[PDB]
């Protein structure tokens, strides 16, 4: 009867665009066009296998100032989204070093996906140059899929809030994983 409300907690470093993509998707607005909110967290209704689902996206701060409080929101979680930007090697690193350790400490059996962000920046000349001067290149899907299977993530998905590419699919998969 009444529609069911999936709990999805979103974690990752603080400048990988994670909140931006949560707001863009749930408001159906391009990243530059939404009215800023002083509130946290987002709800969106999505259709999967012909059926509607309310997706509750719980946003978290990726900063250390919040290591204590953040895990409080972890009980009752149906699925985790672990975000890093594909043009930020430190982001990717923190998936391995901080993020999946943290969520699997607290929720050993709750599924999670690896979410690659800002994929439209793989094409940005300036971004590629900045990475080059440190002998780095943007993360590829291949290398992200690997980390996903090695870490035991249900799968890897990636998107650009900017171009909207892959955005819908990311949350389609999050719901599929919770079910």
């Amino acid at each position: 009867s009444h529609m069911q409300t999936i709990k999805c907690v979103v974690v990752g470093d603080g400048a990988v665009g994670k909140t931006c993509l949560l707001i863009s998707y749930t408001t159906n607005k391009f990243p530059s066009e939404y009215v800023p909110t002083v509130f946290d967290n987002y709800a969106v209704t999505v259709m999967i296998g012909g059926e509607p689902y309310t997706l509750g996206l719980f946003d978290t701060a990726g900063q250390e100032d919040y290591d204590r409080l953040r895990p409080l929101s972890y009980p009752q979680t149906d699925v985790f989204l672990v975000c890093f930007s594909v043009v930020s090697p430190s982001s990717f690193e923190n998936v391995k070093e901080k993020w999946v350790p943290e969520i699997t400490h607290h929720c050993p059996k709750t599924p999670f996906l690896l979410v690659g962000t800002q994929i439209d920046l793989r094409d940005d000349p300036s971004t590629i140059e900045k990475l080059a001067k440190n002998k780095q290149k943007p993360i590829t899907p291949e290398t992200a899929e690997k980390l996903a299977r090695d870490l035991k993530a249900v799968k890897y998905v990636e998107c650009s809030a900017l171009t909207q590419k892959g955005l819908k699919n990311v949350f389609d998969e999050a719901i599929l994983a919770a079910l």
Binding site: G56, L57, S73, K168
Partner: protein
């Protein structure tokens, strides 16, 4: 033979809508054909009303103002509209069709046909109470779409439409679909997406490119309409006006801080109502209204108290969704927090008064939300719940430091 020709076009449109899964547009096509046959037959004295009898189903019927046409044909068309509207999941409109045929069946003593239509009506009203409770009816989502580039779009250049999309089609889906469609037929390097939701001045477009602007909209209703349209279905049917909200600042623009943040609400009027015989309809007229940063603040706060209230007022409460909203009001991690509005505007234009009012209900609402959550939590939270309670107390204290009041 215009009536016959119009029917041929409408029948052909409907088939395409059916293959595409746009069953409301097929259904309107059935209704328009039925309306035109009824108009014809009423004039012949064979049936007691034409076109206008169908206006309750769709105001667009006005557009429609042989022995290929007779009572039997009208009857079969009525039956088709009923099944068409069933398939389009617009159950509430089936009786409007069946009222027109019931007296004919009675006059002919056709009791098996009467039995059949009443069975449909019973099932229709059962579906209505069912989906009114479960929210599993998804009648569609809407977008403003406008194309730019004389060289590419010919006559379509500058034209704005409202597009009605299936189910819960999100911006990411329609925008990528149209980008593909035209990228394919012009070359990916000659097609640009305009993300800016504001009016685009053609004078700053590159003639070398085809541009596409897509913006999500929702049905718009004034106060009088909100009172006449008392259900979700009535706010999803026969809709002509759409709205979206766009950020701006005076130093132009879009996204700024709370102290500088404006919002423009744009209302767009389509030339016809949805649903119609087509799934995209030209914009006829539009206008807008700007709000102040303090007005924006007032606006967002209210939508939050109403939100927390609705969640609490429920027969059965949805805990997760209650938690999502409650946590995001009292335990804010990422964004500025509700207090940022209080600091920016309530620290010692006298509609400052009203922002104060709203903040009064907000603290009470969060209060109610906490009480409710206390009875739903299964211990494994409890700490979580404790923190939010602590956060809520802290927050109340500060708003007093500012409003010099209880709370």
């Amino acid at each position: 033979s215009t009536p016959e020709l119009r029917k041929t076009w409408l029948d052909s449109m409907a088939r395409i809508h059916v293959k595409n899964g746009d069953l409301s547009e097929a259904a309107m096509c059935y209704v328009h054909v039925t309306a035109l046959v009824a108009e014809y037959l009423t004039r012949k004295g064979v049936f007691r009303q034409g076109c206008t009898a169908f206006r309750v189903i769709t105001p667009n019927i006005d557009e429609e103002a042989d022995v290929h046409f007779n009572e039997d044909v009208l009857m079969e068309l009525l039956e088709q509209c009923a099944d068409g509207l069933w398939k389009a999941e617009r159950y509430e409109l089936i009786a409007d069709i069946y009222k027109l045929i019931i007296p004919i069946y009675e006059k002919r003593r056709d009791f098996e046909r009467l039995a059949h239509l009443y069975d449909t009506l019973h099932r229709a009203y059962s579906k209505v109470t069912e989906v009114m409770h479960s929210g599993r009816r998804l009648l569609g989502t809407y977008f403003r779409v406008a194309f730019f580039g004389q060289g590419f779009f010919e006559d379509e250049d500058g034209k704005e439409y409202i597009y009605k999309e299936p189910k819960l089609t999100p911006l990411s889906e329609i925008s990528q679909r149209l980008l593909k469609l035209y990228s394919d037929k012009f070359g990916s390097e000659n097609v640009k997406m305009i993300q800016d939701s504001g009016k685009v001045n053609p004078k700053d477009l590159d003639s070398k490119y085809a541009y596409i602007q897509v913006t999500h909209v929702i049905p718009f209703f004034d106060e009088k309409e909100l009172q006449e349209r008392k259900t979700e279905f009535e706010r999803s049917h026969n809709i002509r006006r759409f709205m979206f909200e766009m950020p701006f600042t005076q130093t132009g623009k879009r996204q700024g801080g709370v102290e500088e943040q404006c919002k423009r609400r744009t209302i767009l009027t389509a030339i016809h109502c949805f649903p119609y015989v087509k799934k995209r309809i030209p914009v006829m007229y539009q206008h807008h209204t700007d709000l102040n940063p303090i007005e924006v603040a007032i606006d967002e706060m209210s939508k939050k108290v109403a939100e927390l209230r609705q969640l609490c007022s429920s027969a059965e409460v949805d805990m997760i969704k209650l938690q999502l909203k409650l946590q995001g009001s009292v335990s804010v991690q990422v964004n500025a927090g509700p207090l940022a509005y209080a600091r920016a505007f309530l620290d010692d234009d006298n509609k400052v008064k009203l922002l104060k009012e709203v903040f009064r209900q907000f603290v009470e609402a969060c209060g109610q939300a906490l009480a409710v959550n206390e009875r739903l939590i299964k211990e494994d939270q409890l700490e979580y719940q404790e923190e939010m309670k602590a956060n809520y107390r802290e927050m109340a204290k500060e708003l007093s430091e500012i409003m010099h009041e209880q709370l």
